[PDB]
Subunit: 261 residues, 6 copies
Amino acid sequence: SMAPDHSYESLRVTSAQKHVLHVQLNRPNKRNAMNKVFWREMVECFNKISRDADCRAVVISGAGKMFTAGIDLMDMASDILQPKGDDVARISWYLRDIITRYQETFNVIERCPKPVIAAVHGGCIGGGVDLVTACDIRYCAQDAFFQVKEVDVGLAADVGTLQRLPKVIGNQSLVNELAFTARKMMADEALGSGLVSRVFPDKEVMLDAALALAAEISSKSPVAVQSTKVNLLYSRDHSVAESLNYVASWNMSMLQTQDLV
Amino acid sequence: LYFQSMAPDHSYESLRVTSAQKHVLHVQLNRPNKRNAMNKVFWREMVECFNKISRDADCRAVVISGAGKMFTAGIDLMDMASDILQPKGDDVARISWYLRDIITRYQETFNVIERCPKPVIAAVHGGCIGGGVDLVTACDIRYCAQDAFFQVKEVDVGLAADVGTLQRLPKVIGNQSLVNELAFTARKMMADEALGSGLVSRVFPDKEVMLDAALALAAEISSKSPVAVQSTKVNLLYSRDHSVAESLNYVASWNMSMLQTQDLVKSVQATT
Amino acid sequence: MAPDHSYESLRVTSAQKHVLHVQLNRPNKRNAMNKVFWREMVECFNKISRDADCRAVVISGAGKMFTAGIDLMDMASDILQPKGDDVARISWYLRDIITRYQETFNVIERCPKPVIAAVHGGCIGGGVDLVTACDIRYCAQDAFFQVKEVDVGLAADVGTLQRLPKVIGNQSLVNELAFTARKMMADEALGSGLVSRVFPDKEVMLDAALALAAEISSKSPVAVQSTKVNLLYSRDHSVAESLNYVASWNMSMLQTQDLV
Amino acid sequence: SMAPDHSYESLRVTSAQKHVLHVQLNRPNKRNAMNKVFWREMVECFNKISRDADCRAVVISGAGKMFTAGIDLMDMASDILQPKGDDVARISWYLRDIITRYQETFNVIERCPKPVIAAVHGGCIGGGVDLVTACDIRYCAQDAFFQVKEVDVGLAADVGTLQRLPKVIGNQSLVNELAFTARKMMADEALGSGLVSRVFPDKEVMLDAALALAAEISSKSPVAVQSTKVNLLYSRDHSVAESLNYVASWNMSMLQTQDLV
Amino acid sequence: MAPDHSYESLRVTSAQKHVLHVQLNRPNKRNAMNKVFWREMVECFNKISRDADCRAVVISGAGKMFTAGIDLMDMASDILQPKGDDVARISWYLRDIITRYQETFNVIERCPKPVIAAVHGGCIGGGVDLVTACDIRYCAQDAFFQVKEVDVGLAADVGTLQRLPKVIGNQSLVNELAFTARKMMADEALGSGLVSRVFPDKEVMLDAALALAAEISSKSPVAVQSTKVNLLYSRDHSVAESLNYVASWNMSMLQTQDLV
Amino acid sequence: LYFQSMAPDHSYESLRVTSAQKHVLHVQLNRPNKRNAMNKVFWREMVECFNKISRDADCRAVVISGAGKMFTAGIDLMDMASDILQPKGDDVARISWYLRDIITRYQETFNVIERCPKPVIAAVHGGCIGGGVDLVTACDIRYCAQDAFFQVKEVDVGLAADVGTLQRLPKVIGNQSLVNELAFTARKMMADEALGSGLVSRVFPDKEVMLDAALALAAEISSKSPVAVQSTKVNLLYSRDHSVAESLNYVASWNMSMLQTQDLVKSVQATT
Ligand SMILES: [Cl-]
Ligand SMILES: [Cl-]
Ligand SMILES: [Cl-]
Ligand SMILES: [Cl-]
Ligand SMILES: [Cl-]
Ligand SMILES: [Cl-]
Ligand SMILES: [Cl-]
Ligand SMILES: [Cl-]
Ligand SMILES: [Cl-]
Ligand SMILES: [Cl-]
């Protein structure tokens, strides 16, 4: 069923099981290319889900033949080929604002305390990698691939891939080679490197597994699960001593839940 | 048969400490009838034990294992209830201050392993559940038997792990999709996946073969200069938590005294 | 032989367009790192950083192995005859030497052109400090890596303890390697992720390293060099700080012709 | 003149000189007490000004007898006396969201790259201190006073005072004593401690000086001035080495301005 | 004399409700800090931190002056007869002693009850490490502060070089004080902001220190102790990180009766 | 009259370096006909000078002053035009990379003062404009004459200060309202306000009285153990940039070698 609070041009949001929302990228005719409305609707959607007491986990997938072809290069041209501002300095301030806004599209996934699972089939290109590396857990079909395309287009990726990809897998030689060459990384290598936790034969089976996972997470104490995501995120970005201090301050209130007794 | 020294420095209810060659101490979780469940004395005795080992000039490496059928079942829920079901303080704020102190003190049980400048090797067989994962993620090296499993059980009990797993597990392996899945689902991770993910360094067919390998590793570490090995642990931990530029600065300030040792002179004159 | 590059311990060539190949060149002494080497690396990579024509670098070793590590004769001169009266004064002297030796591999990281290590045979001690300061690592089937410093009576202070734990995931393994000085062979280096590819022999490995450097050089150098700067920044900072930095970085770099 | 983009219940925004906006807290009958609409309108206002190429500096003052009496305690009761959520843990998540939202009310001043000058007469109590310590420059009339009131109300200040006050003046013994006792700090002591840069005999003279300052800042290169605020803010929060690196990366584009040639 | 508090070097009394008064008590030796002192401070402040009845602390010195600083007899035992064979082993031994001595003043900062220093006469060397770990500083007109360590042949390692620069604004002054070991008298301590009030004599100063401790104790202890925790966090972190922390902190602390 | 050593280590166009007692070096900005305007050679020679002083075992403190009527007029706008009016590189991105390198290199001119472990005392008379404020905020101690003024001039020229003022000025004084006002308005701050704000430690009636006081301070610092004084600077700088807990850790690691000096033994045996 269609989730009622959620009406979007570029996204389709459904209740997939109790406490589980399924957010589907929904421009299959355009291979889910990320146009301007997408960047704005993701922010709207995520922020809603974060405030949704009924939602305990999210799955993100793509409609059609592939997860995403990445940024709508028609729309990306409008911003870069006609930039507002007189001299270079004023164009700089303008472009910085744009980059920061697009970063927010994926930040909202991280800021959402409900776990978010990426279920990727077919291509996940450019902006798609910025998306899935901001999700907590990644699954894919056997036909999936991941590509840090930005270098081919003529820029260092700036909406999250270079910030999150190196922190979600161990092999930095591989991270560097993908970012510098824009080569496609296919499903078995995605699994071998730990970019995905599991590979499935096809999209249908992948989606069933991702929803089963989300159902399993939904069965746990929401206070516990959401406190866990908050604290894992914190730990990624701070020393162990700082993160130990933070969890003590976090759980001093959270241990006072009915879910515990 | 193991016999104590004539003046034993280690006498615990929940732990057994033995000497397993020259320079190697073997710390064994020792409540096998309760599957090494971590009760109130355990949290105290671990701090007392590792602080003593830190100051023990003769110890160069430590192995930690569990007695009986499994490494550990985790927190003794009887004793954890006393703290959480009867919390001291009037209102919510005052209860918070009280719980914060308890969390911090329990964190110290495993902080002491990390603060100990001697390498510490976890040798896990059977279940390593909840508290056990907080324990082993604070060790430097992890080995296990074929029958071992690791379980971030806390979410099943109704809390986010707050004594070290969520702070150290994500720093000891590369695959964060896996880290997140384990933490959110409390599922069991068996020995073969633990090796593939890099949570353990080596898997062995049985507890006896594992334990011998862990002691032999400890003995190999104990053969090197203790200045160099202890300096290596200090600097690896510092590097985990700081930028490369800060950590390069730190190691230069650390080694400016540590290079002034006959250990280096003897090691260079030997290889020359 | 590249114009502007002459060294006692290093050989620099530039066959492929935009690509420089830096070769450790004391095969006679297994490319052991003597004093000249520490200085010439700095000179070499600082030149490379300022070369608008260079887009990528490969580093390999002449002869039977990548490197045996530090030349223990020369390391003795510094440590067996240290300048200064008392301990505190000796310490200040040693600190400066450590910091200078760290610069030898720092310059690789400061060079915004990607640097690919191509390792065959042993890569020992100082050689691990070197390759963990490179962006990408390839090796031959005969390769091995060894954090040799504890066997010599010191914690590694040149770079290995600072970069090795950040370039692979398995910390249990990193710790075991650092505490025991044991050799890690090619198959294990591949499986741990220390290297991203293994090749049958030096020749095929070197060819692949250079073909990778060509593929990199086929890209916009603004984009590629901006990628390296931001990957390095991201390693050392929180996600939020690194997102801030990339926005401030690309606000100029997006105004390039290679993009329009 | 009334600024046209700016229509608020709790704020009055005027063009005070070319390139200068004057934002006036506008509930003089309620001593400019900070009610719910205030917290939401400040965010709206600031974010607008940040995107306003015509604006180069801001002055903030209070209508009526005093700068501000602080939080509307009627409205603060609604949030704390009737908190949403079942057990303590769920109330905690609810209250954290509230604190974070109210923090954003003053964050938007800092995030605005135009310099913001606080012109304080009469009382500046509680939330007023959280406000003025998020401004770049502070002026006051001789009758002004500042009071970290929160401890009297029964809480540690959480919307910015404890985070910014210690970073804007040198004397931490004084900072600590104000925060722990909630005592009023009068104008001469505000000047002596450096909390304000200057004191004026009355509100009228204070406001003229603050506008003169803002006019002086407006006369400079906007690229230079706004780059300066960005970089001072950065320097407060990072080491010298990190901040030197950041300014090099910042000015590599900004030095390519027409204002420079 | 407070129940649970007996010490060789310290006297602890509790006249005013919720207030403890800790007095350095070797007037005979100008409250020079001998070995017992280093240990008993830790014992004392850790007890204070766990005392729900205590809301504020004043620290003063018995006799003619606040403190002459470290007892140079006892500091010799540690430095003139250091345990360990070679330099590296001596270093590990010294590092542990430094860290232990730092704990003596760390505990003041970890104590979430505000601690007010009331200084008269000299406050020398170890005494500056002490008072810069306190939240608030008052002094008598005869007081003076002296970063004495360089005169003894060391950089201050107990706390002064870490906290003194963070408690006042004028770094030119902090640097001059640290490099020269010169005395700063009461009028200068007031003008630099090292102390927030100066009083004519010890008696009036002590009275004011205690009246301040009363004023603090008249407030909600949840609010006051939460204020200290968050001020300390804010000193050590960015504004954005500290705003995050206070939100996570108050989400529980706002659920207090002292508020409703 | 000052005479050079028989083998002078300091020979500069833009700087004069003299020895002003035992252990004290006096570095004088020396382009008085151009009001000590910082031209291309100045940025180079400062780096060469301070790196040499850093490695000079006999120097224990440095005073920096200016020749002629004023401390400095700041950047030589002729030479700054060459870099900014004719920037190397095709497009905007390529120009950016070029400017970034120039900014970084100019930052090094003052970084070297900070990296020098000997205390450095600025003795300012007359104007200290733009670049001069970047210079003196990198020094450890600041004195001035009655006629001195400080001016963060950069905004008047059309840029945010990028060679150190905006990174160090806000860390050397407490009043940030004042810091912000100075930076945004480029107004002049006279000697009496500079003292009240704490930017200078002392003000003197004239340049000669100031200069004598600065040398006497340098001589007083030069009377102390160089291990202790140099360790003090290193640790003060580290404390500026790190949390108290990190800085306590650092000083323990630093002093574990530095306490092993006869300087300490002699200082304790003297006072005993
Ligand atoms: Cl994996
Ligand atoms: Cl692995
Ligand atoms: Cl070395
Ligand atoms: Cl891998
Ligand atoms: Cl380039
Ligand atoms: Cl002031
Ligand atoms: Cl000491
Ligand atoms: Cl003051
Ligand atoms: Cl309390
Ligand atoms: Cl002052």
